[model samples]
Target: GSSGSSGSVSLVGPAPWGFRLQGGKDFNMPLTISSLKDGGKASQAHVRIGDVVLSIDGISAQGMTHLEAQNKIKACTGSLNMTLQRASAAAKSEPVSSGPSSG
Candidate 1:
């Protein structure tokens, strides 16, 4: 129900963050990590800000609406498994990176 520009997936196994989800996007719109909380599960799983989640608990989360996907994650009572990928353009468009120099 909450997709306020971004959402936090407290994945039962790991996590995904910084996501302005959509409906029917499939893998193209996999949840991307923007930031992690200190000592958070995402941090514990070594989840990168640019990483993209591929699936949830052995099920394909692709093509699901924001609410649909949200519900899928919520349905899980314990450690939800997630498959992930590297960051893509769509996943990096939200907040401009203000970290440091890459050159």
Candidate 2:
């Protein structure tokens, strides 16, 4: 039997969007904003942690590999527009914690 394996995107930009990304095809999750650089463009735009990226420059982010998403963002010359969706409290589900447990 063959086992399936998955993979993960990028931080290539002059201004450097100033944000960390998480949850890509590697994780079998949607591309999400994990952190935002304080006072950066993404932060200034109100991009928040846990926000699901829907589209970039009108391009659908659904099912896109991490690298594909990164390239899409990197390709932007100026003025980037992104569609984001914030999960509601009820819809929020935390991934299984993989760190060592407290004693």
Candidate 3:
């Protein structure tokens, strides 16, 4: 489904921190939306999730201030193409059976 880069190191972290998702949606970049799990268990991933941002070419990401990078992406057009590295396998998340309890 999704695609992301894999790390041969001990652990993997989210790329392009503090992602600005559409409509208050929580999201993380450099993460192919479906990267490896905590256990290093890989996952299926793809480039630039509808909710996640990959990067803007010629722009400094994670290196320069986010404000600076955003400005660049803003100027660019055409679907925002980004690099997305996929994992060897997919990782599943634990399930929870409950809804938010409201008064």
Candidate 4:
């Protein structure tokens, strides 16, 4: 599940945006954040785990592979603008009845 939430973030300075990325095998895939480092730029931006990256620096990430997204983020400099959507929390499951069901 995923939320409709969207936001942009600016990445700058000497240090990197401490965040790991994950996606599908091919170019047509979803670029999601696997993890974030404590006190990092991503964490500061409130980017959470399972957040899908929509775009970066106005470049759409619609069909980008895992490596492509990684390289793009690494090559970025100055104020990097990124659009993202956060994955929603899993829905609660219903309890199963212990008794036999009626036919």
Candidate 5:
């Protein structure tokens, strides 16, 4: 049931943390990165603040809701890896200095 403003996912499962990032609908935002607050010193997950998640466990987002994904991840103990594409093209590309600029 996550989907806060600005494309974000929040969930509170068996983990010690009151809530965790489950999944969300990307809306041309940056990658949402947030660590699980399980209080067990878990690894940090790459969840950008504005980025949104639309898939899980190699499954398409279609025919699924935010809560469903949350439950799946919860059942798996936060092993629910997610593959998310930047909503905005610019958001995906990184700044690069190709050799040297021409005069």
Candidate 6:
């Protein structure tokens, strides 16, 4: 499930990092940047919408639930550092279904 080069983003400011996250333990997937507020901290840091978060504030995000990840972010005093991985466009188009039938 992990692929591609991972990048780090550092955000300095207050709470409300200006981004929305989704897909964690509930979805059995890594936390993903679902949306970002325009001109906000995350957007200013160039965090992409589909970037998968690998770690937060030096803590591994491997098995953290959505709430856990959120709480970690919230725990930050005024700065947040996140490591993220972005899937390539080519990989995004690959079909995961087992059957070859069309329909």
Q: Best by lDDT, which number?
A: 6
lDDT comparing candidate 4 with the true structure: 0.72
Q: Compute each candidate's TM-score over C-alphas.
A: 0.53, 0.65, 0.33, 0.68, 0.41, 0.75
Clashing pairs in 4: none
**1 versus 2: better lDDT goes to:** 2
- What Cα-based lDDT does every candidate model obtain? 0.54, 0.67, 0.36, 0.72, 0.44, 0.83
List the candidate 2 regions with Cα displacement exceeding 4 Å.
1-15, 89-103
RMSD in angstroms between candidate 2 and the native structure over all alpha carbons:
12.4
Clash count list over all predictions: 1, 2, 6, 0, 7, 0
Count steric clashes of candidate 6.
0
Clash total of candidate 3:
6
Q: Which candidate would rank higher by lDDT, 2 or 5?
A: 2
Off by over 4 Å in 5: 1-43, 89-103
lDDT of 6 by residue, 1-103 (tens): 7455767888876767888889999778879998888888898977778788899888999989999988998898689988987666424455676757778
Q: Positional deviation of 69 in candidate 3, in angstroms?
A: 1.5
Best by the TM-score measure: 6
Clashing pairs in 1: 26-63
Q: Mind giving the per-residue lDDT tens digits that candidate 2 earns over 72-101?
A: 777775656667774434234578857777
Report the Cα lDDT for candidate 5: 0.44
Query: Comparing 4 and 6 by lDDT, which wins?
Result: 6
Question: Candidate 4: misplaced stretches above 4 Å?
Answer: 1-4, 13-15, 25-29, 86-103
Better of 3 and 5 by lDDT: 5
What is the Cα-based TM-score of model 6? 0.75
RMSD (CA, Å), candidate 6 to true, equals 8.4
